């Protein structure tokens, strides 16, 4: 009766961990007691039994005792005249210099060591290993790369390094201090109204602390200064109060204040942050937090020499690794390319009729009609030996031209593999001859036949479809024209236009332009990058290109109007871009997305950044700027040189730069490029390498540990897993590796000793670690005694990272436009393939937890009021009124952000509330309605649907909360916020556009990003968008919103 007795004969009843090993080949965790073969210089193999955790100092010392018992002892030198070498898991022969390193930390392949006298007399220099530990591949693997572009990258990039090192040691030791501890500062000194009204007629009480002897006692000096007064002024008033006396006159005070004043600088108590330059106190981030949170700043007076004591010398050292030809515009032919044979096409002959090779010339958009070859010999040994003929003359091929191709199946059209290839090489040379091109597999999202967004170059994986092919030969290496040459062709074309008849200028192309037109352009300019421009508009924009210089911000639109297959047009565009006014970085960043591959355009973009983009603003957008490196054609380019120099100039950027590159090192589309860049940084960054190597080592330990839990200690009770965890953390190597280091979430936070009693595995099936470290600062207490973060091997963190970054930016837009919606973008950082750190927010609970803990004995239904009851219990008195204000403000922000972003549906276990009443979301899942891919169809969903619980709290306990002033106020926040993000909607489009490079399934093509257009109602007028947003919010809640 249930299933119409239909048998499923097929059906038999008989976290995602990826497979990386460590410690020893094929074994996550070496046995505590292990046998290691020691290969001696006299040819003897003595086998020691060593402890897993034993240093090489110990193993050497024991080896030379036990050697004596074996033959040929008298041929051995003293033990000191020798070093250990072995084969590591990266298949390279590593000499072990740091003999304090333990057997389990050498990444051996097999357990054996060889005794040698040390070669490469510069031991200094063969601490490249440091670099290639940080990177995750040996430096020697680069030295053996044939590719001249690579070897050129490595040689030429050192310019940037050498220059940056010179800026550090300019006014040293101050500039070194300034590099290592750059000032943590907001962009604008102007203080938002709502911040300025919280302080006392523009004044803050501050607390300066000091030490004398024996560093146990410390002394407050509670000042009350103007907010906008600088670190120096604050150091005076501290020292005045400190040194006022009955035994000192006024004159005698002032003279003692001058001698003391500049011997000291200001530290933030509790973390490595300092105030080392003239900004208003308000403009430093710590202060402005303290103002918002309702806290009194705790700074420390620190002796400059005790600071400069802790700095180290960089000692940068240059590494060991230190014409007449035919103009493209002479070549008198159309382009042809010969497709030869594909060797590795894996296809069912029963399933597939036959296959061909699709091709196209591209610039991100196509310079000609797309074309294919015949369907030959279908699936079996496909070979075609055709010249494909492209209707474009060789001289019109633009600098950034690319050939994009794919092998397809047959209207049964369907791609098998794909590849792209730059028609010009890094030396400006048009590509001629034969090429092998190993192809990429078609990704999740892309159903299309070709893939022009996709990475340029061949797949480094050998065993893949290799489609080899042939480019024409013009009895000469063809080169791209000089700028001087392009500038003349432009000046020529301009005058040539002036003489054209008026009759002829009646097709698609006066000195004085109409006022209706002069205002149509400024309207086009304001449109978002995804409101595709029409052929009439393109012709229109092109024709008034010289007026377009008056509206700098139109450039993105103008550039897409140019015909990149007409060197006439391009050459002139080259002369416009030459000296087009700089534009705001938020707008210039569009020009480094995949739509603008031209070198001159991207150079202009970088010139905008070089002027305007503050170190604050750069480190906000650093994620997108690193990703955008994927769309650069060659290794050496201006963007790379910009970013690298900033990284080496400012250690806070340098930190997140390292991790964002290091993060993606597994992804073979960028490994080589990012590895090469990582090498440069690591070579030039200074002492920070030693610090990074410790972060890097700590994370490799957490990876191996969680890898074991997830794979072998499953089907074991929490109790058993937790014992294993604690057991391992007590071993000397883990103690060593996991104690003295800086948090990757924020290197200002030192992580001290582990408190294993507060360390545990969370309940999740991914087996996250909850870890706890003692804050080893002198004033731990004044900030936080413990510092706890979550390490999660399993989930891909970068979607969340992006969401949180977006939220961070929404807040900043809101706040700095004076309207206080309090978001909590907790810290998230991917450091690997599905490995990461999440910042713990203390004193916060999921709604669900709040509902348990206040749920009666008899489970007849959870009470809507318990959230509100729980909140009252935490906030009594006048405190209450502002706890509801916080909840109302935070709930409104997260409602608007969430709706715009289109995040995973909210519910009781991914919504969280803090004791003080602040609400925030976690675990966002898929961010642009990616589960609409199944159906979607224009869902335009509300993911945060305020149930009663939320409404009750908003309207302080009232019944029928829908109809209060509390809730009218709320709605007007939501409407004011929605509109504010809508006016910065260009930015958010561009941020998502810049993330197409990353392999995030949620972001595969520009129509993934198109969701944000619907949700912000960009095609509509703002009045309609207000009404749209209301409608959306009404239907989701069923009443309330008109």
């Amino acid at each position: 009766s249930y299933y119409h007795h239909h048998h499923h004969h097929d059906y038999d009843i008989p976290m995602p961990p990826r497979p990386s090993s460590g410690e020893l080949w094929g074994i996550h965790l070496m046995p505590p007691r292990i046998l290691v073969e020691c290969l001696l210089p006299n040819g003897m193999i003595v086998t020691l039994e060593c402890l897993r955790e034993a240093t090489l100092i110990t193993i050497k010392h024991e080896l030379f005792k036990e050697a004596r018992k074996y033959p040929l002892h008298q041929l051995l030198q003293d033990e000191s005249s020798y070093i250990f070498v072995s084969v590591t898991q990266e298949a390279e022969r590593e000499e072990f210099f740091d003999e304090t390193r333990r057997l389990c930390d050498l990444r051996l392949f097999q357990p054996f060591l060889k005794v040698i006298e040390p070669v490469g007399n510069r031991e200094e220099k063969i601490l490249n290993r440091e670099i290639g530990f940080a990177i995750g591949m040996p430096v020697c693997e680069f030295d053996m790369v044939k590719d001249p572009e690579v070897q050129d990258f490595r040689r030429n990039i050192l310019n940037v390094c050498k220059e940056a090192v010179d800026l550090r040691d300019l006014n040293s030791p101050h500039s070194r201090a300034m590099y290592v501890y750059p000032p943590n500062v907001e962009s604008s000194p102007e203080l938002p109204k709502h911040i300025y009204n919280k302080l006392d007629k523009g004044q803050i009480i501050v607390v300066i602390w000091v030490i004398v002897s024996p560093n146990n006692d410390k002394q407050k000096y509670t000042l009350k200064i103007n907010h906008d007064c600088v670190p120096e002024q604050v150091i005076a008033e501290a020292i005045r109060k400190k040194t006022r006396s009955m035994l000192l006159s006024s004159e005698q005070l002032k003279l003692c204040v001058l001698e003391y004043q500049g011997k000291y600088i200001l530290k933030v108590c509790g973390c490595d942050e300092y105030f080392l330059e003239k900004y208003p106190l308000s403009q430093y981030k710590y202060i402005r937090s303290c103002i918002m949170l309702g806290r009194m700043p705790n700074l420390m007076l620190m002796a400059k020499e005790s600071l400069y004591s802790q700095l180290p010398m960089d000692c940068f050292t240059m590494p060991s690794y230190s014409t007449s030809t035919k103009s493209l515009w002479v070549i008198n032919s159309a382009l042809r390319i010969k497709i030869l044979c594909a060797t590795y096409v894996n296809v069912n002959i029963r399933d597939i009729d036959k296959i061909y090779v699709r091709t196209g010339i591209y610039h991100g958009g196509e310079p000609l009609c797309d074309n294919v070859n015949t369907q030959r010999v279908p699936c079996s040994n496909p070979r075609w030996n055709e010249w494909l003929n492209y209707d474009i003359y060789i001289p019109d091929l633009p600098r950034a031209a690319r050939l994009c191709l794919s092998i397809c199946s047959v209207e049964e059209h369907c791609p098998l593999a794909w590849g792209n290839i730059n028609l010009f090489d890094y030396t400006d040379t048009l590509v001629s001859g034969k090429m092998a091109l190993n192809l990429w597999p078609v990704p999740h999202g892309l159903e299309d036949l070709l893939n022009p967004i996709g990475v340029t170059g061949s797949n480094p994986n050998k065993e893949t479809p290799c489609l080899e092919l042939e480019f024409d030969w013009f009895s000469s290496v063809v080169k791209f024209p000089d700028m001087s040459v392009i500038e003349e062709h432009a000046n020529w074309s301009v005058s040539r236009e002036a003489g054209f008849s008026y009759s002829h200028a009646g097709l698609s192309n006066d000195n004085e332009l109409r006022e209706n037109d002069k205002e149509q352009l400024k309207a086009i300019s304001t449109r978002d990058p995804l409101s595709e421009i029409t052929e009439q508009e393109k012709d229109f924009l092109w024709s008034h290109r010289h007026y377009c210089v008056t509206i700098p911000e139109i450039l993105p639109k103008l550039l897409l109007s140019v015909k990149w297959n007409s060197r006439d047009e391009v050459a002139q565009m080259y002369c416009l871009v030459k000296d087009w006014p700089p534009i705001k970085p938020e707008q210039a960043m569009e020009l480094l997305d995949c739509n603008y591959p031209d070198p001159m355009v991207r150079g202009f973009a970088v010139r905008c950044l070089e002027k305007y983009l503050t170190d604050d603003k750069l480190s906000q957008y650093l994620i997108q700027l690193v990703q955008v490196l994927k769309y650069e054609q060659y290794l050496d380019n201006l963007l790379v040189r910009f970013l690298l120099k900033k990284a080496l100039t400012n250690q806070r950027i340098g930190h997140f730069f390292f991790w964002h590159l290091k993060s993606e090192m597994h992804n073979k589309t960028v490994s080589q490029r990012f590895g090469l860049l990582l090498e440069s940084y690591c070579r030039a960054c200074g002492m920070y390498l030693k610090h990074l190597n410790r972060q890097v080592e700590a994370m490799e330990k957490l990876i191996n540990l969680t890898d074991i839990l997830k794979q072998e200690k499953k089907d074991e009770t929490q109790k058993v897993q937790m014992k294993f965890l604690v057991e391992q953390m007590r071993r000397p190597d883990f103690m060593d590796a996991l104690q003295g280091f800086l948090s990757p979430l924020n290197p200002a936070h030192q992580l001290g000793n582990l408190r294993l009693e507060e360390c545990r595995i969370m309940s999740s099936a991914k087996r996250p670690l909850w870890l706890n470290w003692e804050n080893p600062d002198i004033m731990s207490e004044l900030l936080f005694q413990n510092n706890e973060i979550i390490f999660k091997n399993g989930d891909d963190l970068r979607q969340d990272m992006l969401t949180l970054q977006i939220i961070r930016i929404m807040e900043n837009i809101w706040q700095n436009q004076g309207l206080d919606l309090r978001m909590l973008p907790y810290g998230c950082l991917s450091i690997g393939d599905c490995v990461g750190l999440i910042e713990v927010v203390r004193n916060s609970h999921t709604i669900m937890q709040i509902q348990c803990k206040g749920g009666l004995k008899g489970a007849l239904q959870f009470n809507s009021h318990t959230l509100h009851q729980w909140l009252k219990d935490k906030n009594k008195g006048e405190i209450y009124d502002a706890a509801i204000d916080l909840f109302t403000r935070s709930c409104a922000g997260y409602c608007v952000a969430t709706f715009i972003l289109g995040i995973g549906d909210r519910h009781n276990s991914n919504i969280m509330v803090k004791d003080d009443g602040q609400l925030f979301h976690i675990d966002f899942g898929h961010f642009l309605d990616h589960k609409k891919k199944k159906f979607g169809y224009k869902r335009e969903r509300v993911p945060f649907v305020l149930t009663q619980d939320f409404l009750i709290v908003i309207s302080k306990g009232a019944q029928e909360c829908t109809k209060t002033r509390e809730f009218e106020r709320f709605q007007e926040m939501c409407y004011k916020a929605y509109l504010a993000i809508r006016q910065h909607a260009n930015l958010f489009i561009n941020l998502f556009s810049m993330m197409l490079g990353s392999g995030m399934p949620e972001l595969q093509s520009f129509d993934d990003i198109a969701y944000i257009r619907k949700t912000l109602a960009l095609d509509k007028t703002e009045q309609e968008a207000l009404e749209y947003f209301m409608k959306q919010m009404n239907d989701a809640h069923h009443g309330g919103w008109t």
Partner: protein, 255 residues
Amino acid sequence: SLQDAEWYWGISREEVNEKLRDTADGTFLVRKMHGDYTLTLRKGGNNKLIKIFHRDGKYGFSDPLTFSSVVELINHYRNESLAQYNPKLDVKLLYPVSVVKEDNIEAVGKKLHEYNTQFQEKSREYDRLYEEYTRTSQEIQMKRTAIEAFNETIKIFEEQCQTQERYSKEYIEKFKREGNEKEIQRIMHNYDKLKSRISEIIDSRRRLEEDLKKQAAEYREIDKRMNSIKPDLIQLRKTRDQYLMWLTKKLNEWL
């Protein structure tokens, strides 16, 4: 007919492109305050947007306005190319494009669920295999470096039984008599350990290489099956779009 023109939809920028997605060169359809209607044409995997302006009765792209209707203007260009209007548009409006006839309404709706279930079952099979593919790529290249590391290990050991032959046979002739069978037996013992160890290592490398071919074998089979799932996954997706068009909230039950 102005509104009941097959190709006139009347839709936002987004759902045009999703209807234009994965069609051939020449395909079209027709679509605020900027002008009036928009001819969105597809050319070689890219959408060209052409504005239609309506003023004193006439409809058109720019100056040659002598077409008395929206439906007028398209019939001309379905026959003819757009190059004469704007030079570089040498492509006609060839495919003016816009399933059981189950006039039942509810039974079309049930089929939408059957296909969408199949599609969703299919999308997981594809996703499973894509991850098996990418694991298998990783497991292979670790197998390769292991082989290298093995080979480099062996070189160090082959070198070792060489390194001893220099000094061990310097000791035979430099004495011989003193500890003849005594010292040489215990030097012979080391040597026979050392070579059998090389023999174990070589056998270990071998044993990985046979696993690497079986891996590389499975890798092909995964790719093979991905490539056979892919075209089905399109046509299943494409039928689901057409059923869902022919219908058009309530739906979300069927999806």
